[PDB]
Design a protein around this ligand. Structure first.
Ligand code: S1P
Length: 417
C-alpha cells in the first residue's frame, strides 16, 4: 500500500520525465519557424539537454548517496517543471535562453532518473522488486509517445505551440507534491581501480560501444523523424507525430517482448545468444531505418511501416545489454560499470547526434539550391548516418559475442572466489 503507492507515483513521475524530453521534438517545426533558426539550433536543443543530463547524472548519483534522496528527487521534478513552464514564455529573439532552459531541464531530470530507481529498489525486494522496477521502465516508451502526442495535439488545439510546454508542468507540480507525501524517507540501503579493471574487459568495452551506437541512432531519429516526415508530406503535395508517438509506445513494448522471446529461443543453441541476438536485431533495424528514407520519397505509409519494424528491432536489445553487463562484470564493479557505460553511451551517442544531423543537413543545404524539396532531401541525407551507426553497433555486438564466453567465465571464476 504505502510502498505500492510510492512505486505508482514514481512511475507516474517517470512518465512525466520522458514526456517532457520529446515535447520539444514533437513541436520542432513550430520552434524553427518561430525562432528562425535552421536545423543546427534545432539539434542543439536536444544536444544541450543530453550534455547536461550526462554530466549531472553522476553528481546526483553522488548527492543521493549522501543526502535525502526524496528531497533531491522532489526538488528536481519541481525544478524542471518550472524551467519548462517559464521557458514556454521566452520571447522570439532569445533562442539561447531556450537552449539553456533545455539544459536546465536536463539537469533536473537527471536527478529523477538517477535517484528514483534506487528508491524503488530500496522499497521492494526480490520478485516484487523486479516487477516494480519494470513498471518504472515501462514509462520510457509510454512517456516518449505521450510526449509526441501531447506536443502535437496541444499545438493543434490551443492554436499555439507554447502550450505544449505549458500543459505538462502542471502535472509535475502534483507529482512532486505526492512524492513529498507518498514516498517514504528511505535511507541509503575506488572508482578508478574499477575503471582500470573495466577497460581491459573486452566484452564490457564492446557492449558499451554498441550501446553508444544504439543511443546515437535513437537520439538522432527520435529528434528528427517527426520533422523529416512532415517535409516528406510537404514535398508529396500534427498527424505525423501523433502516429509516431503511438508507434513509439507500441514498438518499445513489442521490442522488449520480442527481444526477450528471441533470447529465450536462442538459449537452446548458443552460449553467446544474448549478444548475437543484439547484433542480428541491429543489422535488421539498419535495413529498415534506411528504408524510411526510401519509402518516404513516395509513400508516407511505407515510411510508417519501416519506422514500426525498425523501432521494434532497435528497441529489442535494451534489456539484453543489461544482461550482458550483469554477466561479465563482478558485482563490486557493477555500479561503476553501469555509471561509466551510461556516460559513454551519452557522450559517444545522443549528446551530439541531433546536433551532428542538423549540422550535416545545414552544410548540405548551403552548398545546394534552397527549396522545400532540397530541405527534405538534405535532412534525409543527414539522417542516413543513423543506419551506418546501427551497422557499426551490430559489429560491436558481434565483437562482444566473441568474448562473452571468456569474460563471463572470468566473472564467474572471480565471484566464486
Ligand atoms: C526508427 C527508430 C526511432 C527511435 C525513436 C526513439 C524515441 C524515444 C523512444 C524511447 C523508447 C525506449 C524503448 C525502451 C523500452 C523499455 O525500456 C521498456 N519498454 C521496458 O519496460 P517493459 O516493457 O519491460 O515494461
Amino acid at each position: 500500500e504505502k510502498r505500492k503507492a510510492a512505486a505508482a507515483i514514481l512511475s507516474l513521475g517517470n512518465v512525466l520525465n520522458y514526456l517532457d524530453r520529446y515535447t520539444v521534438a514533437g513541436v520542432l517545426l513550430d520552434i524553427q519557424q518561430h525562432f528562425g533558426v535552421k536545423d543546427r539550433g534545432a539539434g542543439l536543443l536536444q544536444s544541450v539537454f543530453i550534455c547536461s543530463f550526462m554530466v549531472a547524472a553522476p553528481i546526483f548519483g553522488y548527492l543521493g548517496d549522501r543526502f535525502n534522496r526524496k528531497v533531491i528527487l522532489s526538488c528536481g521534478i519541481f525544478f524542471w517543471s518550472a524551467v519548462t513552464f517559464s521557458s514556454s514564455f521566452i520571447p522570439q529573439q532569445y533562442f539561447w535562453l531556450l537552449v539553456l532552459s533545455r539544459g536546465l531541464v536536463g539537469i533536473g531530470e537527471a536527478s529523477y532518473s538517477t535517484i528514483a530507481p534506487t528508491i524503488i529498489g530500496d522499497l521492494f525486494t526480490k520478485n516484487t522488486r523486479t516487477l516494480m522496477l519494470s513498471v518504472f521502465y515501462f514509462a520510457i516508451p509510454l512517456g516518449s509517445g505521450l510526449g509526441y502526442i501531447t506536443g502535437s495535439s496541444v499545438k493543434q488545439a490551443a492554436g499555439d505551440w507554447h502550450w505544449a510546454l505549458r500543459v505538462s508542468p502542471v502535472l509535475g507540480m502534483i507529482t512532486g507534491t505526492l512524492i513529498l507525501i507518498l514516498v517514504p524517507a528511505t535511507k541509503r540501503g575506488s572508482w578508478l581501480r574499477d575503471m582500470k579493471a573495466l577497460i581491459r574487459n573486452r566484452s564490457y568495452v564492446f557492449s558499451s560501444l554498441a550501446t553508444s551506437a544504439v543511443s546515437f541512432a535513437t537520439g538522432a531519429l527520435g529528434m528528427w523523424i517527426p520533422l523529416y516526415l512532415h517535409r516528406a508530406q510537404v514535398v508529396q503535395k500534427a498527424k505525423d507525430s501523433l502516429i509516431f508517438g503511438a508507434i513509439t509506445c507500441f514498438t518499445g513494448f513489442l521490442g522488449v517482448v520480442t527481444g526477450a522471446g528471441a533470447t529465450r529461443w536462442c538459449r537452446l543453441k548458443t552460449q553467446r545468444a544474448d549478444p548475437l541476438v543484439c547484433a542480428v536485431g541491429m543489422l535488421g533495424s539498419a535495413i529498415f531505418i534506411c528504408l524510411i528514407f526510401v519509402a518516404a520519397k513516395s509513400s508516407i505509409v511505407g515510411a510508417y511501416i519501416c519506422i514500426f519494424v525498425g523501432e521494434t528491432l532497435l528497441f529489442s536489445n535494451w534489456a539484453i545489454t543489461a544482461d550482458i553487463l550483469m554477466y561479465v562484470v563482478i558485482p563490486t564493479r557493477r555500479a561503476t560499470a553501469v555509471a561509466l557505460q551510461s556516460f559513454t553511451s551519452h557522450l559517444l551517442g545522443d549528446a551530439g547526434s541531433p546536433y551532428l544531423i542538423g549540422f550535416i543537413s545545414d552544410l548540405i543545404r548551403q552548398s545546394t539550391k534552397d527549396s522545400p524539396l532540397w530541405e527534405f532531401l538534405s535532412l534525409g541525407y543527414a539522417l542516413m548516418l543513423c543506419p551506418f551507426v546501427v551497422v557499426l553497433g551490430g559489429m560491436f555486438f558481434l565483437a562482444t559475442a566473441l568474448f562473452f564466453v571468456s569474460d563471463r567465465a572470468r566473472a564467474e571464476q572471480q565471484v566464486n572466489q
